[model samples]
Target: STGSATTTPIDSLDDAYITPVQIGTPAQTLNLDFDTGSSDLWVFSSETTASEVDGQTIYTPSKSTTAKLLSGATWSISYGDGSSSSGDVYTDTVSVGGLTVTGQAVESAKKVSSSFTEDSTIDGLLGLAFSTLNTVSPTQQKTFFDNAKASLDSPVFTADLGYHAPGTYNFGFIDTTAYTGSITYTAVSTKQGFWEWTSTGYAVGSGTFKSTSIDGIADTGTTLLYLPATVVSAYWAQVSGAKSSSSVGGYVFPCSATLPSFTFGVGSARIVIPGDYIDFGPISTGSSSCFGGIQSSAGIGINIFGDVALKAAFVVFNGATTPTLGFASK
Candidate 1:
């Protein structure tokens, strides 16, 4: 029941990771974002001329003999960016790498409003979060990971996301050699349907660790590292002339600033995020101001340890009865 799949960062920004998925009878392959931040596996479909296409492959259920309408079932979901989409549901055979799940729910979007802007590398999002967060109504649907875990040798999946290189997703078993050092496990609260974890402390660069519980989710779907305003401010304070401006957006510092590494504790394990990762990049073409990868989660409520922090560690999403999260240096 073991399986593996490779994931590639869309671009140098490491905005998101895309994994190819096979669906329906004839196996229409589509690259999807494996979003642990969400719980509904949704995609653009034929009915949605808003398919946001040219690059995105639209899923045609009518053409797939095995596709079945879930009758009266429908789904509506709102994203973090305020954009929302809603549509009906269907079931089809879905495959990721060597793992296949039959009767997997495939929510098909009929239309997408405005401002979902795109690179077209991702056809849809394959939510890996708990089913409790699923937006499907009347009859709730399980995520692809949930449906496939039963056949998995060990109910778990590991995320090995990379910066400029290709990473991989492994299911059922852990690749002992994929990471360095021992793994540290932490209790995960799925009550909110997220892989929520509480970090015991944090530190900026070579400074001493600050003992403060920071609760957040390991969101691979998210692009930046979002923490408390105080923490974000402290990091930027170390850089001369670094400041926050509404017009400038978030926090920005000089591109040549020697950014400090960030460290956060998971139980007793202290995982470090490189400073270079904190420097997102130049604000714009020919601009000397560079946006900080670590941002304030003031309005975001929960802190987010997204790809910015995740790329530094090997993450394991355990789906056992009492789910837990495992982290290791890579």
Candidate 2:
């Protein structure tokens, strides 16, 4: 069977896209960020302090007849940005799009870092990464996708992330209407609980493609495309007033600067991110400074092909033998 869901950007340009997910017996619907970066379905819940929860929606397990406590189990997660959350565990019915998993492990947060508490729009994160990365204590938990994969028509999902527009996330099926041309496939290494792949190289604008193997992950949770410091520097060099900003904490350029297109190699295919996509948008209202979507991943270790880069193409996350990534122009 096939299941599909529509995802919309949380903001006009920044942040991430979210999809509605149904949880529990009576179906408590909540909007969640479908993150491929992590592997835990943790949400703000009744367990959280009233003062700690801002205006965000909270999931109440008591309202669900099918919810069962995983007695004594707990989970805590930390993000790359130092954001974190911790809580107890429960198993309940969790459905996304039209696919439902009977006993999905749901983490109910007792405490959330400022980053999560401040984001009122996001109710929780639906992790699509490998289940091996789950943070549930004692025994690890499996993601909804993992628990439901065997029943799928095909062990695959497609992410059609758009900029300032709505996109579709298809489970167990691919919609040919969502993309153009042929979809290029590349082998992926999931040793790090990510859809990691190696790029042959990259180039700026219409420049010649360089041949260097760059290892990175396609993460939907992140906002920007993080690359090596040298690669980030080369791209910004093309912009007249681009500089690494201390205030902005990334490369910033004059809003009026003419930016160059950035391209990266996936197998034999070259996916190009247009210049307009490279400029993440103004750093502040009425300001002439804008942040670069491509930045240095020096401290982060591995490169991150975040939303900015992924939105330019139609991506296929294959969970079949030897998990692979397929890309096509949108």
Candidate 3:
């Protein structure tokens, strides 16, 4: 099966991206992406070409009192969306909160042209999602987790908001008191690195999806949920204030007083998406229109639960063991 893809417009100035973590003795601060799509820690470097884009912080290894560049091994990653970046490998002292982890694996992109890179709000992505494409070699791959696993106050968790500042994307210990309960665990089947879950089927409001059920994958890499056209249309109809826009592929709605709700049956666990997340930010279409967080990509034959859903819950990518994902409370 082909991988799924989606896009979400984030708050332009929200500091929810840059998180501070401590690494190694004496403690060092590092910025990381709370990405649920891929698991790798990357940062900007002084060697990065300045002409690539504007409004991003470029890391200068020369400036850092402690930094090491890997020899021979280099990397370049291209997203399904046609964006790519290439850079050299390096070792650095990374820190999050008071927790310190040294020799953390990272990439420094000397050249980047990803759509995300165009957005000044995103400097670099730290993919926390499960994937075999880590630049962190097998030898140094466990830097961040090995150091903090023992001292971490709680199981690792992330909270992403549409609003916050550069350093506001907080990481480190998860405060159990802030959430409800632990996550329901699911073992990842060997397919691609994508997290898969079998849905008995799907439904919207009072309407049920086809009798011939399909597979649903929980993807943090994608931002929108793709569904069959018939099912997608049915879903819009059930949404109280939703309206179809003339534009080619998306949907828009008034997230005002009366909003719609989405629910999915995953085994015995029921996943519910609040309408507010669907109406979080204003769409980029030329008006004060709010983007329907859920858009349509009919015939795609797959459904992806993106970051909006990921942020509301605590997720764990235990790729080390049978490639399973465990969910818990924030």
* Candidate lDDT values, in order: 0.89, 0.90, 0.53
Give residue 82's lDDT in candidate 2 (0 to 100). Answer: 95
lDDT of 2 by residue, 1-330 (tens): 678999989887757888999999899888899998999998889999777799888889999999999999999999888999999999999988999889999999999999888888899999999999999999999998898899899999989998778998989998888888889999899999999988889999988888899999999989899999999998999889899997789999999988899998888888889888877788989889998899999999899999988999999999997899999987
Candidate 2 off by > 4 Å: none
> Comparing 1 and 2 by TM-score, which wins?
2
Ranking by lDDT: 2, 1, 3
Clashing pairs in 1: none
Model 3 lowest lDDT segment of ten: 1-10
Q: Candidate 3, after superposition: displacement of residue 18 in Å?
A: 3.9
CA lDDT of 286 in candidate 1? 86
Clashes of each: 0, 0, 27
Candidate 1 structure quality by residue, lDDT tens digits, 74-137: 9998877576668899999999988999999999987665544355677888999999999998
Clashing pairs in 2: none
